[PDB]
Each structure stands twice: as structure tokens, then as C-alpha cells.
Design a binder for this molecule. Structure first.
Ligand SMILES: CC(=O)NS(=O)(=O)OC[C@H]1O[C@@H](n2cnc3c(N)ncnc32)[C@H](O)[C@@H]1O
Length: 668
């Protein structure tokens, strides 16, 4: 008699609620959680962070968490309507000072970064001392190129530890870094370099990932042929293979830094000075450069890292994402270093050299938290439990999932094998535009449901709106689109040189609120469930189906590895469901009739969800197009089903781009 249902799971609901396990109870010598031990302890604190009396908590947290050069007077001002959001406006600080210097002063030899190289043997620890020195050298290099406060600097770097040095060097001097995924095409890089109008670019000669070479300098040379503003390129010698270097314009990182001293003063930045531009990916049109301020962004990432992952001073936090993704900005670099702990820079893939890489990593470094995307989790689940069963992994207390809904089936695999049923699983919902985690369980306090984001984070006041009426749906057991009622410190302040695009996209669809673009439901118990992108909804004869529920139903079938469902025009039902399925490699599609597997999947969807949810067609494919932003390229599959595959655009964001040519063949 519940209008909203959990994402489909094999475990009955009665047996599917997971209270904080002993490692998250302060037992067995593990640290005490910062918030606990139950749901009410979370509400008691959160209620201090929203509403008309929350200034006090926020003022105290900002003064406790960050080192300031000048105190602020006003806590907050502004709003969504014109996009004039302000937090701590009169304060001054520097992000590099808070992520490096202050920690270097207390414990210089403490490990700031665990650099997990593409080849495991080349891995090493980078202390705060070394990281600060390299950051200062690069900052000195940038100042000699004439970079001033407020100038954009493009960064095209792979996942080597110096990427952190380059982010922080820009922040140290007040420049605005703009990081682009290594491996993006020359065209994509060009569009971002030209939009941010930078005069300096930082890159490598080459990157190494999964044993394959990323030809970064060659791609940069092709892009710069159409980037007339770029005058200096700083090239890090990562592999040492011969690459072209333009005399005058191109200089070697090691040769330039050797000329510079190893300390550099910090630019004193206003709270609202821009910290960075981060261009989103996966759209056809103009790239969208999301801008973040300094003090609110930093405080938000520091508080989320502390509270969502229950970080403590000696923790070794392992976020395995790429720094070209907001997840890397916030939970590799800014969040963890702000808190003064050890953070991971993972250069490889989850299956190089074998699908045991993640767990070999955890046991070698004694990682205490692990944070990756559902795409990685489904991949590891796909390769079998042999690569996980005989690892220790007991250093871990918290496992995190970010970037897409995590199917209960994958949630359980994570819970059973990575955590051995002794970690808390935090499903973190947020966006590039929100700066930091928006909805997630606090692991010492919240009992989890597989596939639920649970409850909003401090400072976040979220609601559900009927998109048909535009009115808020009060109470529980409601479904609609997710909106936030009030600004929060780490919200993006604008889209670079395109504020109108910022207002029209996020602020005007539901005037007075911030519009995430996701469908959501709040269940009988008040847990939030992120259903998927509003754009991915399929309307079958008046029934609106979300992607997370159908993909979750499909993966409950034995042998299914990963799925993706997209809609297309249908005369009978308005829109029809088309499902793309990949199976485990041990599956014998010769012994099983493919017509029979498609029929068994259609029944499984009809049982779990409804009579209307069955797919009209099902395509069996070896893999799906995925990005390093934790997402499946559904728009691409939708266009291919629509016959518009001839003009799909740039697939540079997809991990293995050759897969789209296979999907085209099988759909035709
Ligand atoms: C962090 C990130 O991904 N920033 S992002 O800008 O790259 O994407 C944001 C979009 O990603 C989807 N998304 C991200 N996390 C989850 C999650 N935990 N559960 C369900 N959906 C999720 C959602 O659609 C967002 O709107």
C-alpha cells in the first residue's frame, strides 16, 4: 500500500535495512563516528544547518574548519533568482594554504598523497613537504609567465600526482584552473581552452592508463592550432617518449621548476573569488563551464569529506575517480587535503593488470575508505568474485558510490565482497553544480537501503515537486523532481561568461528553487531515491518509467552484468522501451537461445515493475558506452535507436569509444 517502491532487489524489504556495522560503531578500536548512533542524531545536527537560525552553526563551522587571513562579518546573502549567492563575503583565505601549508607546518613528513601508478611497482607516497614544494615551484613558474590573480589556466593532465600540484599552484596564486579529462579529443580540448580564454596550458608529454598510452602532447598540438590566446605550455615529463615541442611556446616542467625557489607566498583571496572552472561533458552543444567560489566550495568539500566518510586524522581515503571529474576536484584534492589526511591518486583502471587491482591496493596501503563509481563496481562484479574473495580489506570502514544510481544487485556485491558485510555503504548523490555531496547516509548514524541516497546533507533543504503542477509535494510516499529550497555554501555561482545559461538551466524551470534535473521519490520512511535523469524518462502509454528501476529489475536476472534502457517513438504506446544488455563473460549464449533470454528478461521486468514496463526490443551487446563521470551514454543509445546514429558528435568522453560502432551494427 506504498505508492513509491524501492529499487528492485532480490532481498525482501523486511530483510533489506542495514544499520551501521560494528566498524562504524567505534568498536574493535576503530574511531568513534562524528555523528551517531542513529537517524535522530543526524536530524538533531542537520536541523542546526537549515532554516532561519542556521547562520550560527555555519559561522562556527567556517571559522573552525578553515584558516582565514581576514575574518568574515556576513554569513550569507543573495539567492537563486539573479544568481548573486554570497557566503562569508568579507573573508579572505587561500585554498592552497588550507590544503598544504598549514598541514606542512604541523607534520611535514605525513603522507599527503598515495600515488598509485599505472604500474603497481612504481607507486609511492608523496609527503606534504614534497607536494607543497612542487606546488610552490609550479606557482613560481606560472607567475613568471605573467599569470595574474583571476586569469584562467587550462590543465590537461592524466592521473599522476603532480595534477594536484597544478590545481593547487593555480589556487595558490589566485588563478582559475580549468581541468579537462586527459584523453579528450583535440576538438573538445580546443572548445574548453577557447571558452575559458586562458593564456597558459599545463599538460604531460603522455599519460599511461591500463597499459595504454594517452597521447596528450600530440592532442594538445592539434588543439592549439585553433587556440590563438595560448602562449605558454608547461609539459610534464611523465613517460619520456619523444613528443614535439614548439620552441618558445613549450617548456619542460622539470626544467622550468628547477629555476624556481621551493616556496611561494599565497595570494589573499576573497571568499567569492573564483576558485576554478570545470566544464561538464557529454552534451552536443557549447561546453558548460561551471564556476565555483573559494570559501563556500572549500568548506562544503571539507565538511562532506569529514561527515559523509567519517574521516579521522590518520585515515587513508581512496577516491579512485579522475580529476577531470568534479568527484576528483572535491574528494581527491580539495576535501581530503583541506582536512589534512592522506588521499589517493589512482592512475590505473580497475582491471589493470587484473580485476584485483582495487583490492591489492587496499591491502597494500591499508585504505580506510573507498570511493568509486557504479560503473567500476558493476565491472568488478562482472569479472567474478575470485579477484576479491581472498583479500583482507579490513582496514576499510566506509565504501562510497557516486555518479549514477547503484542497482541493489551491485550494492549487495559491494556490501558482500568489498566490505565483507562490515562496512557502511554511502551512496552519494550530487552534481558538478552542487560542489559537494548533497544527499548521502552519514555512516555512523543512518541505516541504509540498497539503492537509496537517504537523507540530505547539512545545509541542504530538498523537496519534491510535481513537474505537472509545479507544486511541492509535502510528506512522504511522494514522487516527482528534486529541487533545493535555499542556497548552500558550495553551490556553483555561475556558468563561465554565460550567467543566463546558469539561470535558465537551474533557476528558472521552477522559480524560487534550484533544479537538479533528476527525478526523485521520498519513500514512506523519508528516504530519498534518485530515479535517474528527467531526460531519460520513457512514457509508455501514460506510464512514466525511470531508468534506475528498469535497469535494476533487469540486473536481477542471472548472468546480467550491466544494462541500459532508452525510449523511442512508438505509435501504439507513445514511447517504447529498448534495452541494451551485457552478460557475464562466463555466459554461454549459444546454449541459451537469445530469443529465450529476451523473453525471460521481459517477464522479469513485468513482475518486478509492472505490465507496462516490458521492453519492445532487447539488444545483447558486449559492452555499453561509459564515461569517467560515472555515467552511461544513454543519449547516444537513444539517438542510435532513433536512427540518428550517423550524426552523434564527439565520443571522446566514452572510455572505450569503439563500442559505439558495435551498437550501431547490432541495432541495424
Ligand atoms: C557527482 C557527479 O556525477 N556529478 S556530475 O555532474 O558528473 O553528474 C551529476 C548527475 O549524475 C547523476 N548522479 C550522480 N550521483 C548519483 C547518485 N549517487 N545516484 C543517482 N544519480 C547520480 C545524477 O543524474 C546527477 O544529476
Amino acid at each position: 500500500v506504498h505508492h513509491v517502491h524501492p529499487l528492485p532487489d532480490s532481498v525482501p524489504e523486511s530483510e533489506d535495512l542495514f544499520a551501521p556495522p560494528p566498524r562504524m560503531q567505534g568498536k574493535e578500536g576503530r574511531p568513534k563516528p562524528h555523528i551517531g548512533p542513529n537517524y535522530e542524531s543526524y536530524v538533531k545536527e542537520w536541523a542546526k544547518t537549515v532554516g532561519p537560525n542556521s547562520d550560527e552553526w555555519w559561522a562556527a563551522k567556517a571559522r573552525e574548519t578553515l584558516d582565514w587571513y581576514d575574518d568574515f562579518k556576513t554569513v550569507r546573502a543573495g539567492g537563486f533568482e539573479h544568481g548573486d549567492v554570497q557566503w562569508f563575503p568579507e573573508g579572505t583565505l587561500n585554498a592552497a594554504y588550507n590544503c598544504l601549508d598549514r598541514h606542512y607546518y604541523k607534520n611535514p613528513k605525513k603522507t599527503a598523497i598515495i600515488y598509485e601508478a599505472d604500474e603497481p611497482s612504481e607507486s609511492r607516497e608523496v609527503s606534504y613537504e614534497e607536494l607543497m614544494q612542487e606546488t610552490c615551484r609550479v606557482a613560481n613558474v606560472l607567475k613568471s609567465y605573467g599569470v595574474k590573480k583571476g586569469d584562467a589556466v587550462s590543465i590537461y593532465l592524466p592521473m599522476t600526482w603532480q595534477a594536484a600540484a597544478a590545481f593547487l599552484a593555480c589556487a595558490r596564486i589566485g588563478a582559475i584552473h580549468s581541468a579537462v579529462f586527459a584523453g579528450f579529443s583535440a576538438e573538445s580540448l580546443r572548445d574548453r581552452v577557447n571558452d575559458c580564454e586562458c593564456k597558459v596550458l599545463i599538460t604531460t608529454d603522455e599519460g599511461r592508463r591500463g597499459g595504454k598510452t594517452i597521447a596528450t602532447k600530440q592532442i594538445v598540438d592539434a588543439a592549439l592550432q585553433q587556440c590563438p590566446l595560448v602562449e605558454n605550455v608547461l609539459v610534464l615529463r611523465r613517460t619520456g617518449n619523444k613528443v614535439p615541442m614548439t620552441e618558445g611556446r613549450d617548456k619542460w616542467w622539470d626544467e622550468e621548476c628547477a629555476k624556481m625557489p621551493a616556496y611561494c607566498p599565497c595570494e589573499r583571496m576573497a571568499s567569492e573569488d573564483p576558485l576554478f572552472i570545470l566544464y561538464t561533458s557529454g552534451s552536443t552543444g557549447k561546453p558548460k563551464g561551471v564556476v565555483h567560489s573559494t570559501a563556500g566550495y572549500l568548506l562544503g568539500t571539507a565538511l562532506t569529506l569529514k561527515y559523509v566518510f567519517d574521516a579521522h586524522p590518520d585515515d587513508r581515503f581512496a577516491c579512485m575517480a579522475d580529476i577531470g571529474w568534479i568527484t576528483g576536484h572535491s574528494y581527491i584534492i580539495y576535501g581530503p587535503l583541506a582536512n589534512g589526511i592522506t588521499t589517493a591518486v589512482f592512475e590505473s583502471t580497475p582491471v589493470y593488470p587484473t580485476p584485483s587491482r582495487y583490492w591489492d591496493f587496499v591491502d597494500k596501503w591499508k585504505a580506510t575508505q573507498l570511493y568509486t563509481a557504479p560503473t567500476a563496481i558493476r565491472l568488478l562484479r562482472r569479472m567474478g568474485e575470485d579477484h576479491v574473495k581472498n583479500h583482507d580489506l579490513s582496514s576499510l570502514r566506509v565504501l562510497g558510490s557516486v555518479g549514477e544510481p547503484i542497482n541493489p544487485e551491485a550494492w549487495h556485491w559491494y556490501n558482500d565482497f568489498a566490505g565483507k558485510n562490515q562496512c557502511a555503504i554511502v551512496d552519494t548523490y550530487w552534481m558538478t553544480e552542487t560542489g559537494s555531496i548533497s544527499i548521502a547516509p552519514l555512516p555512523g548514524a543512518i541505516s541504509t537501503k540498497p539503492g537509496s541516497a537517504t537523507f540530505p546533507f547539512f545545509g541542504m533543504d530538498v523537496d519534491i515537486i510535481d513537474p505537472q503542477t509545479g507544486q511541492v509535494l509535502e510528506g512522504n510516499d511522494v514522487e516527482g523532481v528534486l529541487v533545493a529550497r535555499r542556497p548552500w555554501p558550495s553551490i556553483a555561482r555561475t556558468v563561465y561568461r554565460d550567467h543566463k545559461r546558469y539561470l535558465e538551466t537551474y533557476m528558472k524551470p521552477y522559480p524560487g528553487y534550484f533544479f537538479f534535473g533528476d527525478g526523485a521519490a521520498r519513500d514512506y520512511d523519508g528516504y530519498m531515491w534518485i530515479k535517474g535523469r528527467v531526460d531519460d524518462v520513457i512514457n509508455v502509454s501514460g506510464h512514466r518509467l525511470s531508468t534506475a528501476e528498469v535497469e535494476s529489475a533487469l540486473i536481477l536476472h542471472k548472468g546480467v552484468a550491466e544494462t541500459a534502457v532508452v525510449g523511442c517513438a512508438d505509435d501504439l504506446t507513445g514511447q517504447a522501451v529498448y534495452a541494451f544488455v551485457t552478460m557475464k563473460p562466463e555466459f554461454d549464449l549459444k546454449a541459451t537461445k537469445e530469443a529465450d533470454l529476451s523473453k525471460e528478461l521481459a517477464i522479469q521486468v513485468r513482475k518486478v515493475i509492472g505490465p507496462f514496463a516490458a521492453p519492445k526490443k532487447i539488444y545483447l551487446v558486449s559492452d555499453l558506452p561509459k564515461t569517467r563521470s560515472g555515467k552511461i551514454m544513454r543519449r547516444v543509445l537513444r539517438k542510435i535507436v532513433a536512427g540518428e546514429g550517423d550524426q552523434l558528435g564527439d565520443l571522446s568522453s566514452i572510455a572505450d569509444p569503439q563500442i559505439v560502432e558495435e551498437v550501431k551494427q547490432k541495432v541495424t
